[PDB]
Every structure is written in C-alpha cells, then in structure tokens.
Short mmCIF file of C-alpha atoms (C1' of nucleotides) in Angstrom, two decimals:
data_model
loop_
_atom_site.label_atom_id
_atom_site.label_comp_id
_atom_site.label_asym_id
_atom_site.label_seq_id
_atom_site.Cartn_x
_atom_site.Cartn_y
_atom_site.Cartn_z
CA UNK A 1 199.19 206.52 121.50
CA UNK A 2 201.61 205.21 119.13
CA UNK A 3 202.06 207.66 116.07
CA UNK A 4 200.58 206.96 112.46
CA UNK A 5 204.06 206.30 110.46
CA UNK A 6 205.32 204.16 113.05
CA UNK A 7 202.24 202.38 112.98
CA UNK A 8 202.78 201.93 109.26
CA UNK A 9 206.61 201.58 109.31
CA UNK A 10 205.77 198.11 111.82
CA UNK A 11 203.89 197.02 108.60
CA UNK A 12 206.48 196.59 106.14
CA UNK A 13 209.02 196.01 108.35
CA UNK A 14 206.92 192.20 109.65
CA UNK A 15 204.31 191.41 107.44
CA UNK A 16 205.74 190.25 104.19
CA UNK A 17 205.40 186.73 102.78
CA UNK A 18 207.42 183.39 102.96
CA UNK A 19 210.99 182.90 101.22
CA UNK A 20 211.61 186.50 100.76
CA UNK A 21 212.56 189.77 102.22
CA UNK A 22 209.72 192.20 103.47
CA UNK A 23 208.28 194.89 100.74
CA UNK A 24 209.79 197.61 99.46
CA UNK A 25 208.65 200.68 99.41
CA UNK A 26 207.55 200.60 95.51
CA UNK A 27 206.36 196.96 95.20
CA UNK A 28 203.65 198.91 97.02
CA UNK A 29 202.80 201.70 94.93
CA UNK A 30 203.18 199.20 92.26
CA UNK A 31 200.75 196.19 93.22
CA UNK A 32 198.87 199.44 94.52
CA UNK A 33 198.46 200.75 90.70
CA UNK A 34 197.67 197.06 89.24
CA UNK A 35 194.91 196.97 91.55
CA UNK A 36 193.46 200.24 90.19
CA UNK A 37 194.88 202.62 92.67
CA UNK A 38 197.11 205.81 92.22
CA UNK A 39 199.35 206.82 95.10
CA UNK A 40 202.26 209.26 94.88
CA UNK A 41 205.90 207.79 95.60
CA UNK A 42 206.88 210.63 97.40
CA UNK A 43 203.74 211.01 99.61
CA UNK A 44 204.56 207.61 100.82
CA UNK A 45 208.22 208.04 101.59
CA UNK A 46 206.77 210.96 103.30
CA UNK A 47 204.40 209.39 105.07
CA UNK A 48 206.18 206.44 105.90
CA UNK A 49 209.30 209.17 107.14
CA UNK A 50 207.02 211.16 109.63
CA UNK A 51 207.19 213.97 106.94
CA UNK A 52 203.31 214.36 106.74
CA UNK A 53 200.76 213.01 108.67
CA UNK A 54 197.04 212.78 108.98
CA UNK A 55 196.36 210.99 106.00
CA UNK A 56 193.11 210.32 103.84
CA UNK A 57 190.24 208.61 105.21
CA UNK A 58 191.14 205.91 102.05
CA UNK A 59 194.70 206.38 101.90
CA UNK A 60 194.78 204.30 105.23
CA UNK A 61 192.65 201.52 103.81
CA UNK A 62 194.44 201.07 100.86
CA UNK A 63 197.92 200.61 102.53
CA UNK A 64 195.64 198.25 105.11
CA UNK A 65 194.80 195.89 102.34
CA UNK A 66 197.63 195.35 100.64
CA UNK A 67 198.73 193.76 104.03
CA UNK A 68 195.59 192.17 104.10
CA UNK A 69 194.61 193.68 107.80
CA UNK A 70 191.83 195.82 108.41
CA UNK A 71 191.94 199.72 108.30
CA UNK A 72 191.60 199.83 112.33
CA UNK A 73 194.90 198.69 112.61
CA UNK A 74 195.34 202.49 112.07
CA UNK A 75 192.05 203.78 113.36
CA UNK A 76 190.99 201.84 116.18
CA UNK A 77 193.64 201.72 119.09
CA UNK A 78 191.84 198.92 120.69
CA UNK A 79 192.29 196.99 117.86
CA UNK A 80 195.42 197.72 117.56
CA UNK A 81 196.73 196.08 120.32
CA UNK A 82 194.74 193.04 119.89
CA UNK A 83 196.95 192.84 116.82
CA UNK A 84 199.88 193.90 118.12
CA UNK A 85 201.15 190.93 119.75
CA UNK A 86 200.98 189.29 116.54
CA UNK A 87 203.43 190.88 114.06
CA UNK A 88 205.54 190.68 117.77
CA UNK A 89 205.04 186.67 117.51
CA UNK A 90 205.61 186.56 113.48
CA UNK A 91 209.04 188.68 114.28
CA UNK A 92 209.38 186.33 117.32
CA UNK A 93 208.58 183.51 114.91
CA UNK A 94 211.69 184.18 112.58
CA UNK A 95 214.44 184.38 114.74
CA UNK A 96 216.95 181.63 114.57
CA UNK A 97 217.65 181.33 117.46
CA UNK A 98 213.84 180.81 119.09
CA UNK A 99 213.85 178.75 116.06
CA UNK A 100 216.66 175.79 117.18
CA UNK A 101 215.80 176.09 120.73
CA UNK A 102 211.69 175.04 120.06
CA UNK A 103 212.88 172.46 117.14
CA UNK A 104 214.62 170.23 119.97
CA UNK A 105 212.16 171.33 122.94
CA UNK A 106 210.09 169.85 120.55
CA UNK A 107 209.23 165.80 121.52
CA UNK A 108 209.67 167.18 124.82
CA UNK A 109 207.02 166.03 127.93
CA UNK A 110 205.11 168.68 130.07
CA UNK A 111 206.19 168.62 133.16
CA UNK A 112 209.79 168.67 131.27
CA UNK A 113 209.41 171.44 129.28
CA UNK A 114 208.78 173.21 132.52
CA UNK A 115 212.04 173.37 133.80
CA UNK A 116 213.38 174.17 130.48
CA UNK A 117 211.04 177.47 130.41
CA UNK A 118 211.81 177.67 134.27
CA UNK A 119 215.74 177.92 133.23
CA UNK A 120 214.66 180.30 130.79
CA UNK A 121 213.28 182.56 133.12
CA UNK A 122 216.43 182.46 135.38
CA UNK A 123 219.06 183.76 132.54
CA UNK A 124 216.26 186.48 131.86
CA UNK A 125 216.25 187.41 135.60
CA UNK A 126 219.96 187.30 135.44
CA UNK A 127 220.25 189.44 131.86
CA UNK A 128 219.27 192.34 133.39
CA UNK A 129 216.11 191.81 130.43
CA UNK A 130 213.55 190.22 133.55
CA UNK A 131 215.04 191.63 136.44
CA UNK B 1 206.40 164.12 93.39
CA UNK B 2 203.08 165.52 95.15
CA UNK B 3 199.73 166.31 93.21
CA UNK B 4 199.95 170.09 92.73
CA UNK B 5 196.03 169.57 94.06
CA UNK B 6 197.94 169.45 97.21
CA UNK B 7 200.55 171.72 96.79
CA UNK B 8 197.92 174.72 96.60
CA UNK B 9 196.12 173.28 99.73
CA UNK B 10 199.47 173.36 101.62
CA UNK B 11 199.37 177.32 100.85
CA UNK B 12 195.60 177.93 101.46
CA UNK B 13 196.10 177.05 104.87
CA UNK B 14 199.59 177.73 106.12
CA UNK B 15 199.55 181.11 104.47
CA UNK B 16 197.54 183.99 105.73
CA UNK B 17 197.95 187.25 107.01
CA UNK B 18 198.28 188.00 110.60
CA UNK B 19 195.43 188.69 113.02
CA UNK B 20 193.14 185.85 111.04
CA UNK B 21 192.56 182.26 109.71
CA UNK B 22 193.51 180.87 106.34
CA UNK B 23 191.79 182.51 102.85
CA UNK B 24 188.44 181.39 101.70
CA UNK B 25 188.21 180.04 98.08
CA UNK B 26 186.12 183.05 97.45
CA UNK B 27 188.51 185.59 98.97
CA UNK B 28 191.29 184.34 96.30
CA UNK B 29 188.63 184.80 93.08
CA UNK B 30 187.50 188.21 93.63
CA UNK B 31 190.63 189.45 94.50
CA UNK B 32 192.08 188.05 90.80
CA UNK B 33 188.95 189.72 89.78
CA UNK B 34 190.23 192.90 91.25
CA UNK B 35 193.88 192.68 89.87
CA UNK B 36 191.70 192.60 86.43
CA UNK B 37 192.60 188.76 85.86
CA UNK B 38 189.60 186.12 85.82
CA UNK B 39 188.96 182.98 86.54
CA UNK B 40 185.78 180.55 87.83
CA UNK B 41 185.29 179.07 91.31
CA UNK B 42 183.56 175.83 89.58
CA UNK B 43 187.30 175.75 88.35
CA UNK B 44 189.40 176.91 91.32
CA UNK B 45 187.38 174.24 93.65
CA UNK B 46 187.78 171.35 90.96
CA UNK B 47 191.72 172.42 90.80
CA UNK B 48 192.01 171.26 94.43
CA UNK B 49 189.63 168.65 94.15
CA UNK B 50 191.15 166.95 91.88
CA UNK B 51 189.12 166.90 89.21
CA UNK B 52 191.35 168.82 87.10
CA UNK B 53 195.19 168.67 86.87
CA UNK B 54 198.07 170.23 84.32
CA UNK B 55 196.81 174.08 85.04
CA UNK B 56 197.53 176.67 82.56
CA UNK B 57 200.93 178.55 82.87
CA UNK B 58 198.72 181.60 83.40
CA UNK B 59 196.71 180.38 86.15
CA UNK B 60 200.02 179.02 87.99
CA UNK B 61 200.86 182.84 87.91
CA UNK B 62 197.95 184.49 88.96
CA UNK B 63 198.18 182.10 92.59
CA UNK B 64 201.37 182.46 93.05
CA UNK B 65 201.27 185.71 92.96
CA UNK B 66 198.26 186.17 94.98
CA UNK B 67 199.98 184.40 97.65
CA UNK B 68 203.01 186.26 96.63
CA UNK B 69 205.26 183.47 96.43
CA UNK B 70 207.73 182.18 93.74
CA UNK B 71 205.54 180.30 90.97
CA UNK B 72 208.22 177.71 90.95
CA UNK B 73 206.55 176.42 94.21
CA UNK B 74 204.13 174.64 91.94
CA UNK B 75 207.02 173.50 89.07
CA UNK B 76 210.32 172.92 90.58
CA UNK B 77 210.26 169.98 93.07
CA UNK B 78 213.53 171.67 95.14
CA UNK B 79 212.72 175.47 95.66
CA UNK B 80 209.51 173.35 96.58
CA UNK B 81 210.97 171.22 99.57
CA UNK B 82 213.30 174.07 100.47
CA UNK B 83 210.26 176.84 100.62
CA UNK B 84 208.05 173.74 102.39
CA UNK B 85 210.53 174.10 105.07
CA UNK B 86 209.87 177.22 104.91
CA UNK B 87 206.43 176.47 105.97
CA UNK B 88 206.87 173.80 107.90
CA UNK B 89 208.36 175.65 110.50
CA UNK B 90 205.29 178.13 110.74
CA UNK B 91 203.24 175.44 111.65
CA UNK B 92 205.24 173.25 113.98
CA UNK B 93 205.99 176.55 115.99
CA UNK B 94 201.98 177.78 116.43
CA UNK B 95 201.46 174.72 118.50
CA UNK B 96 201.37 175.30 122.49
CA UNK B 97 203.66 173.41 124.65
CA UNK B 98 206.30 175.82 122.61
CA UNK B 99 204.65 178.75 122.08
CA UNK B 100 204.77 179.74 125.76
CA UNK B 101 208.35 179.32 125.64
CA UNK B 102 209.86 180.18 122.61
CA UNK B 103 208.57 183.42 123.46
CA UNK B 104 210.27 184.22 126.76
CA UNK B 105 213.36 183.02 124.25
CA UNK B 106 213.12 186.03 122.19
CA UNK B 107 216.02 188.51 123.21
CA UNK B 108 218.17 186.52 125.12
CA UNK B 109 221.92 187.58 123.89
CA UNK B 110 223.03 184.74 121.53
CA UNK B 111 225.29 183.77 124.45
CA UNK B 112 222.60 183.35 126.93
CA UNK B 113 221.23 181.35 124.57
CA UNK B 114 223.51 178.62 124.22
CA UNK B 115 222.75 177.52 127.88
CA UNK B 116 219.36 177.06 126.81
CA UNK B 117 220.19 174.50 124.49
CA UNK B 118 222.85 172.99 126.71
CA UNK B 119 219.67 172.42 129.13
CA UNK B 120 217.71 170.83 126.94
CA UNK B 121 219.96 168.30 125.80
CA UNK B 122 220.10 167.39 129.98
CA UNK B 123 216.35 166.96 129.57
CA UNK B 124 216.75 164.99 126.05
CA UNK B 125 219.36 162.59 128.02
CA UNK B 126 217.51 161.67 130.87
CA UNK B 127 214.52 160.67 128.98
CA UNK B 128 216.42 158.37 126.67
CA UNK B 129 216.38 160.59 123.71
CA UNK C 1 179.46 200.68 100.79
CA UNK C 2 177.89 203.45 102.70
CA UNK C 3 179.31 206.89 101.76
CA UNK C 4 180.80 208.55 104.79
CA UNK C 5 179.06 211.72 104.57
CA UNK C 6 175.61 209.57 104.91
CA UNK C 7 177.44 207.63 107.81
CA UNK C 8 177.91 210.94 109.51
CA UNK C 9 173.92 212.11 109.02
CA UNK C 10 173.16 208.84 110.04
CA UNK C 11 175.08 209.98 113.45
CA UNK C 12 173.60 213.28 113.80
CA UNK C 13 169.98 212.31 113.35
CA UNK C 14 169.58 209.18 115.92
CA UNK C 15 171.94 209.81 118.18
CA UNK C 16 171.28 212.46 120.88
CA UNK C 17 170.07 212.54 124.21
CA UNK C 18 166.99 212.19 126.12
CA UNK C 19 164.36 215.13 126.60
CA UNK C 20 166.28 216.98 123.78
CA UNK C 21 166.39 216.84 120.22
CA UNK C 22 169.16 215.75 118.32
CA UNK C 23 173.05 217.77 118.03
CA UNK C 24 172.51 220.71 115.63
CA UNK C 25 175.81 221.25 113.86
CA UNK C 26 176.92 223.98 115.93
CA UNK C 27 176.98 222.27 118.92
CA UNK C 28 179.34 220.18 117.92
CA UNK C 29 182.23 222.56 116.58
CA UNK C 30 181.20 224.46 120.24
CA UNK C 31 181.70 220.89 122.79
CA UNK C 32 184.27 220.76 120.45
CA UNK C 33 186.40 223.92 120.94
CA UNK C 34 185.82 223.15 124.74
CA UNK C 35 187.41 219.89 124.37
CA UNK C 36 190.31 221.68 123.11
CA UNK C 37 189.95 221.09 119.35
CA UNK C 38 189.89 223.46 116.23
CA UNK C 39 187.54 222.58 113.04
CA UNK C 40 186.02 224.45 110.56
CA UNK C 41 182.42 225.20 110.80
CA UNK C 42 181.90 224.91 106.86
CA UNK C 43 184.09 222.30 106.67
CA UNK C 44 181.66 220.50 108.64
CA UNK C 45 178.82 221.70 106.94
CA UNK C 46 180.99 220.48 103.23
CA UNK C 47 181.56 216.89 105.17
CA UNK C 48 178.16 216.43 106.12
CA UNK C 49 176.54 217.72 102.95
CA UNK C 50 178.76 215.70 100.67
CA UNK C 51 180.47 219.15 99.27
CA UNK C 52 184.04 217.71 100.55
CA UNK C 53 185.39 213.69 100.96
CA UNK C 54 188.19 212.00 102.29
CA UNK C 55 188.09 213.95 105.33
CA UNK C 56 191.72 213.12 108.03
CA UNK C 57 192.46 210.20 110.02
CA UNK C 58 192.18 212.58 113.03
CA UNK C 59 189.07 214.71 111.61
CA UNK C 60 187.05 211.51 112.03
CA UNK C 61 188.78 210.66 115.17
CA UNK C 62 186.78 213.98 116.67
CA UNK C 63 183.55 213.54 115.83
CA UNK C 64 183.36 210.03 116.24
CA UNK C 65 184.05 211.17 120.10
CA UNK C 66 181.67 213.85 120.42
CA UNK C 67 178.56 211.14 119.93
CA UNK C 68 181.37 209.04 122.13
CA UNK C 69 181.28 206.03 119.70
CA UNK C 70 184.18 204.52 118.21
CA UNK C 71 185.73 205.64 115.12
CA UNK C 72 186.36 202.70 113.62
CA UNK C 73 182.34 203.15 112.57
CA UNK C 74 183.40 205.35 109.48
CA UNK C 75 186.83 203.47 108.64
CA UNK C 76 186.34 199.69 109.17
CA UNK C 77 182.68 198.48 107.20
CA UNK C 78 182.24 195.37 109.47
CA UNK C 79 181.82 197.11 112.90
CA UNK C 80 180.02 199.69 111.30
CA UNK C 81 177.67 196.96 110.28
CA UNK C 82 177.67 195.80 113.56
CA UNK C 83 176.35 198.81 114.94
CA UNK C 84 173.88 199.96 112.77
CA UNK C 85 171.44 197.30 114.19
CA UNK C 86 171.08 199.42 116.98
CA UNK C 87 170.72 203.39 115.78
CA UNK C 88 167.66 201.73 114.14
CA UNK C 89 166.91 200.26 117.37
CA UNK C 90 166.93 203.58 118.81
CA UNK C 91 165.06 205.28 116.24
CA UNK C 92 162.72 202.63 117.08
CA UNK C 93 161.87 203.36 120.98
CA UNK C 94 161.26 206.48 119.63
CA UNK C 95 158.48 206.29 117.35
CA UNK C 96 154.72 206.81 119.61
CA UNK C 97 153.01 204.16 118.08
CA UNK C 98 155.74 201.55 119.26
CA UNK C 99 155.60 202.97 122.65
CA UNK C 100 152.21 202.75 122.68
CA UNK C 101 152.28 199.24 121.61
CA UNK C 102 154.70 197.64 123.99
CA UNK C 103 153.21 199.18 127.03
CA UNK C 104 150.46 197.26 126.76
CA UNK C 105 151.85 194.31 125.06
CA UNK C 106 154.23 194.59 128.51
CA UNK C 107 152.40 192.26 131.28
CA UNK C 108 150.94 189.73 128.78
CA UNK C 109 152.00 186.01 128.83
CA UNK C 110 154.76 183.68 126.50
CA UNK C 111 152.27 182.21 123.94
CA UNK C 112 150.13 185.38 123.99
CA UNK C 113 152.82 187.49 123.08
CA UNK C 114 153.00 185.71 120.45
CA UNK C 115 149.20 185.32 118.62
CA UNK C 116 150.44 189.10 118.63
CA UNK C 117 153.79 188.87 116.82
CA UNK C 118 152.09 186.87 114.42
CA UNK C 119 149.22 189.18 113.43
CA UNK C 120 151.57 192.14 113.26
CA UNK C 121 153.43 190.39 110.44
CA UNK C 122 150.32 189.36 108.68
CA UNK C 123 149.28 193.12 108.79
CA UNK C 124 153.28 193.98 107.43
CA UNK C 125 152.34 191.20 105.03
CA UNK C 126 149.53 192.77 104.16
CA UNK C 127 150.79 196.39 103.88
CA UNK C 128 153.40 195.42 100.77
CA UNK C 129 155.78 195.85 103.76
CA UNK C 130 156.85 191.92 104.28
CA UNK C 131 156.94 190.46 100.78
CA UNK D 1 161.04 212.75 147.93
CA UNK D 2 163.98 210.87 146.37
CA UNK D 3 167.58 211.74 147.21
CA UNK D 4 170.62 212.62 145.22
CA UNK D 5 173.14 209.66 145.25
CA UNK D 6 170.06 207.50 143.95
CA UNK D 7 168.85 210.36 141.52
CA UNK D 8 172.98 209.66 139.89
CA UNK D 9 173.18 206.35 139.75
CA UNK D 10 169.94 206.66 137.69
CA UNK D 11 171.36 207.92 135.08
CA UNK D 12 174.72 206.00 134.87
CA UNK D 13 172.48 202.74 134.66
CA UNK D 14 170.39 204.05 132.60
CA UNK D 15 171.97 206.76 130.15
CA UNK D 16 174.68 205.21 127.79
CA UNK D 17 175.78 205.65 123.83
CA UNK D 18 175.29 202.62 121.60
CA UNK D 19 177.67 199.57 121.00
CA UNK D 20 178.33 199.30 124.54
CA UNK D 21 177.25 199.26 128.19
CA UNK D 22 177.21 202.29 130.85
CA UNK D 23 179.98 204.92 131.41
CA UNK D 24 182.61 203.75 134.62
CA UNK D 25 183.01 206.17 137.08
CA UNK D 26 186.33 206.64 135.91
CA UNK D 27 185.47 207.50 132.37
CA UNK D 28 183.45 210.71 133.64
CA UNK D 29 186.51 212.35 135.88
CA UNK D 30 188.61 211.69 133.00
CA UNK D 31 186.08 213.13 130.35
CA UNK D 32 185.72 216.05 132.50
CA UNK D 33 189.54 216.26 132.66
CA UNK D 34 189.50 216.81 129.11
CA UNK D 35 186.78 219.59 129.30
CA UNK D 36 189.36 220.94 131.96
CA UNK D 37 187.42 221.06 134.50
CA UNK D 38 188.86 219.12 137.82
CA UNK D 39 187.15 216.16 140.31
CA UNK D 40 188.72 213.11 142.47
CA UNK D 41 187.27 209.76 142.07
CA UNK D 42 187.37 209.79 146.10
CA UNK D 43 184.54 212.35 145.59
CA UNK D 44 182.72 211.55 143.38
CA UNK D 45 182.42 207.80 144.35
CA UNK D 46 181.55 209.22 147.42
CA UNK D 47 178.76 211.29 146.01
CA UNK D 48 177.35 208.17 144.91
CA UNK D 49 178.18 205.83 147.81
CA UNK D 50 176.15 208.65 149.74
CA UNK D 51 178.97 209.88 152.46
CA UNK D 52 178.82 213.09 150.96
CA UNK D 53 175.62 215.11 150.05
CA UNK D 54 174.91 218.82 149.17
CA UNK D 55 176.79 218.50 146.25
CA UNK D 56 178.10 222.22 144.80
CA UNK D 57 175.96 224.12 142.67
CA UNK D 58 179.06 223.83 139.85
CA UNK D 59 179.98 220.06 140.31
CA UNK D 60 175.98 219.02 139.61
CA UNK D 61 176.38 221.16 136.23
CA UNK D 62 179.86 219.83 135.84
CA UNK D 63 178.28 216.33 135.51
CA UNK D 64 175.20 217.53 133.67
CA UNK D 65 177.01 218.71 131.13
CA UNK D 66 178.68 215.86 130.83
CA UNK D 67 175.40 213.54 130.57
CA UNK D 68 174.11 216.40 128.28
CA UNK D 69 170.62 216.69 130.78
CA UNK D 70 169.42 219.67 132.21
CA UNK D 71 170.91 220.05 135.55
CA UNK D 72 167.17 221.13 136.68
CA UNK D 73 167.22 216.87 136.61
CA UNK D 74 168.73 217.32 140.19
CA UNK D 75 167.24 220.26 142.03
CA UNK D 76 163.82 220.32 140.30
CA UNK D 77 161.47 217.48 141.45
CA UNK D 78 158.56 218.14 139.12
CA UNK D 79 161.17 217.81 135.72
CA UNK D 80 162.90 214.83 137.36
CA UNK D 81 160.30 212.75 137.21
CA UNK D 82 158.82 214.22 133.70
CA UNK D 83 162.18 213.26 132.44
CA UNK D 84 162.24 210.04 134.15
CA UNK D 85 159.60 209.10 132.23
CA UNK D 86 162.05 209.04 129.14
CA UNK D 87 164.57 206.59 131.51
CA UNK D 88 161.99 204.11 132.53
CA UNK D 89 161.19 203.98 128.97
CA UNK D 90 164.19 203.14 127.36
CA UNK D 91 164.29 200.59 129.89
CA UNK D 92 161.23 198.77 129.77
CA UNK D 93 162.42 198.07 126.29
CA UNK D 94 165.24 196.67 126.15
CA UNK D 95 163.55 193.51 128.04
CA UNK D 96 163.88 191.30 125.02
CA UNK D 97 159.99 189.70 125.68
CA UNK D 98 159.08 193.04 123.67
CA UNK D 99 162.42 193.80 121.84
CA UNK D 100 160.82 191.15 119.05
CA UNK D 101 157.47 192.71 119.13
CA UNK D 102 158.57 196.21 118.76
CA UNK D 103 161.09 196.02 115.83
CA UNK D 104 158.39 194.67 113.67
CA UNK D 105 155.73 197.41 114.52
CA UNK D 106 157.47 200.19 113.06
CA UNK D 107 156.72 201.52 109.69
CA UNK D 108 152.68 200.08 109.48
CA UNK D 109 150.53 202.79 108.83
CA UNK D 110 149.46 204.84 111.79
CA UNK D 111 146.21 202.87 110.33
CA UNK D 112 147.64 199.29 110.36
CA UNK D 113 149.02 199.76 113.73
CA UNK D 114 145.53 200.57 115.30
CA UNK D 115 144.21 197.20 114.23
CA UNK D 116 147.54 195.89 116.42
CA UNK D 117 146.41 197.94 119.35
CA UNK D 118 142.82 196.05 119.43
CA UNK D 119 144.13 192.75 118.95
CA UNK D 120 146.31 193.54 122.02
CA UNK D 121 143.06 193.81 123.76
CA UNK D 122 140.90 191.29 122.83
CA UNK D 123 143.98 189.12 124.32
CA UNK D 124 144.32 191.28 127.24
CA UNK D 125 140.52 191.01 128.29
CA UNK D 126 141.01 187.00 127.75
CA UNK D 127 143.62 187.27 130.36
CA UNK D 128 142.47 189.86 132.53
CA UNK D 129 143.85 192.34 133.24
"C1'" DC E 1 189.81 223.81 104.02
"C1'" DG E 2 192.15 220.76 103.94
"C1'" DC E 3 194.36 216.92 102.06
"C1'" DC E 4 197.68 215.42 98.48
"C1'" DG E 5 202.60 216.69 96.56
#
DNA sequence: CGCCG
C-alpha cells in the first residue's frame, strides 16, 4: 500500500544510532562496499527519489541489513506494519518535548498519572489533532 | 571510572535495532567476520567477563564501530557520561506507566505542551514532591 | 541458502490442488493475465530454470499469489524455513504407501500406536535411512 | 443425496494453501473481484447459510474456478463423492495421533514398508478389530 | 527481459 522509496526513505530518516545524526546517503554505499557489496550511487539516489522502482530481489536485502531489519520490511506488508509503530515510537522517543514531560511524570503514582494522560487527551480534543 | 567490562554490556543491551531484542555475542563475531576483521568468542565473552581487561586499540574500533558509536565511549570518561545520557533516556522511557502517555504527547504544538507540564507539577505538589 | 529458482520448483511441484496434478507453467502466466498482470512466458521459463536471477520485488510479489502464499517465502529465509515443514508434509499425504499405512494405523489405541512408531524407525534404522 | 450449501462449506473447511488456515468468505468475493468478475457477500453468505439455493450455472463456475475444482464437484453426484475421497483424506491426517506415524513412513522401500503393514496387523488382530 | 545505470 505504501510505495517502495517511501518505505526506504522512513529508513534513513529513523533508524540511525545514538549521539549522531541519521545516515547519509553514502555512509551506505560505503559500509555497503566494506562489507563486500557493490551498489551504484546514483541507483540509490534514484531509488531512494522515486526515480526507479522495482528493485532486485537482493538489492532490498542488502539495504535491509545494514539497518539490521529483515527484508519483509519491504516485502511483506503484514510485517510491515507490525514494525511500523516502532520507528513511529523511536521518532516519538526523540522528541524533546515527550522527553521533559515523561522525565517528571516519572515518580509519578497510577491512579495519578491518569489524570495527567486524561488532561492530555483534553488539549488533543481541543487541538483540533483528537477531535 | 567504570570497568570497560561494563561499559560494553551497557551497549549490548541498550543498543539494538528496532523491531527486536538486544545482539547476541555471536551476532557481533560473525558480523566482524563479515566486515573482513577477526576476532574469537573465547575472547569477546572473557572481555565482558572480566577475565581480560586493557583491549587492543584495534579491537576498541572494530565494537565501536559495529555498534556505530564514537570509540571514545570506551576511552574518554565525559563523551562517556554525556552519550550514557544518551542511553539512559532510551531505557527509562520503554518502561509502561509512560509509554502510554508520552505517546498521546507526541504532536501537541509546543504551546499545548506547556500546560502539560504545568499539570504535572499540580500532581507533583499534592503528593509532597 | 536456498537459491530462489529451486524455491520456486519447490512451489510448482507440491503445491496444487486436489484431483489434479500440479500448475504447468502456462497456467500460471494464463490465471495470471486474468488477474490483470503481464509476464513473460520465457522469462518464467529463465526464472524457473535458473537461466535468469534477481528477478523484481513485484515479479515475486505475483507468483507468490498465484499458489496464494506469502511472498515473504522467497525474500525473508526464516519464514521460508518455517514453511517448508509443511510442502513436505504435503508431499507426504500424497505418497500411497503412507495412505495406506495410516488408514489402518487410524482406529488403533495410545500405546499401540506406538509398538508401531517404534518398529518403523528400527526398519528406517535398518534401511541406512536413520543413522 | 446431499445438498449444495453443505457440498460448499466442504470445501472451505477443507480446501486451504499452506502456512495458514481456511479462506474467509470475504477473501473469495474479493479474489473474484480481482478476476473481475462481481458477487455480494449478502449472497453468497446466503448460499451457504442455505436461504438461497439453485445457484446460477456461472456463479458455481465462478467459485470453482476460484477453488481450482471441477465445477462437475457440484452438479455431478458420482465425481463428488470420487473427489471427496481426496477431502476426507487430507483430513483424516492431519489428526496428529497419525501425523507422527506418517512422517516417518515415507521414503522405506516399497519393501520395508510392507513389513510395517503386517506389524500393523498382528496389533490389530490383538485388539480386534 | 528485465533489472541495473
């Protein structure tokens, strides 16, 4: 349902690793190389950029590993979703804001942090985001 | 400072990708082996055992960048605390009671916001806190 | 592991359905026009036979849903492991002899059941089959 | 003899691919969709509920084709049961009592597996039966 | 043929 590059263009743009920006482009095509693998520059911009699509059977695995997620991601739509929430929650997980707000609702009892999420729910009704 | 036994540990498991668990010992050799650099599981497991200390420059490199992190994790004792925030966070936040709502936080202007934390602090004050 | 090629055969030689034999390689480019979908007859034929690899995301897509199993069977090697338990299965309640085995085996008590299992694998042991 | 409705259901129970369980009703009308060939899930349930009988010559081969039979399966009452045969065989089956018995009996000699076939009976006539 | 530039 959702289209290949866009699929792909999620990838870089959440998964990446701790204390650092997300990957480039190259440091792909580059750790793709040291591990023994060719792949054209160019047929990745223009993959990534809707360009071209259909890709290799492998040339979906290979981008799929150096992510560290399995090939389905791509593939399998079922799977997909299953992982979709995910790179949602890492994205979710970044945010400053979210951040400060859980830091000092943390230490915070039960039936306490209910009306806190409660309160949440009423500016997202009134945002025009729940409503 | 802390043992650098424990300073890998801290990465095997609050690093790992997304839609998993934390890397196996095993995972981390083969894929060194893969890259075209070697090294022994006898030695990996003793490293955070214990049973060995002082690692080689080289080895140092081929973790960090496995775990694609700065090297200087292992060395420098400030990038260290201020990249263990860094993780610290990650696993604070995958706990429950905050999980549910940190994620009905997400998207609320930055305005909106505010009146969230205003809340809480109500919440903080009347439990004495 | 497995090649894909050999993953396909696999797919065309157990899977098919009952009172027939299995999908020749026409039918499949035919149920496959009438689902709306183009492919090349010898491009099959190449794919199947090993003549052509690395065949399109969408290419496996196709015929993974004309034996209506899921296509993450080529692409991820986990579920494909997962399922190959049971083509053999299949290929199994096929063979006569088995039939003709379990339909008398059928209707026979727990412990007798087994005195049976048990000389069946001293005859496998005894056939150079079970080490 | 047997009706229609029944005859159906028959072979959604029993006529499924591997990895999973057997087709929704939903799954068919959709499938046939993409053929392009049209059908309401009113109807169709209702073929198989049994408030409607008689079905059309064209939607019986419209679901045939779909279940890849011969649409004989329906009209012809002979065939039917020949082919039930092949139903009520996968079936049997897939009762696990046997499941362990019958993986191991394939591949011994078409000689081997006669001396399996006696031992069978000299149990069987202990029993019975 | 079609996937890889």
């Amino acid at each position: 349902s959702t289209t290949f590059a866009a699929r792909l263009n999620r990838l870089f743009d959440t998964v990446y690793p701790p204390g650092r920006g997300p990957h480039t482009s190259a440091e792909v095509i580059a750790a793709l190389k040291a591990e023994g693998i060719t792949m054209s520059a160019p047929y990745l911009s223009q993959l990534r950029s809707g360009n071209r699509t259909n890709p290799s059977g492998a040339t979906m695995a290979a981008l799929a590993n150096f992510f560290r997620i399995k090939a389905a991601y791509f593939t399998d739509d079922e799977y997909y979703e299953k992982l979709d929430k995910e790179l949602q929650w890492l994205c979710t997980m970044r945010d400053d804001g979210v951040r400060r707000i859980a830091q000092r609702a943390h230490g915070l009892p039960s039936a306490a942090q209910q009306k806190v999420l409660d309160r949440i729910d009423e500016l997202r009704r009134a945002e025009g985001i729940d409503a």
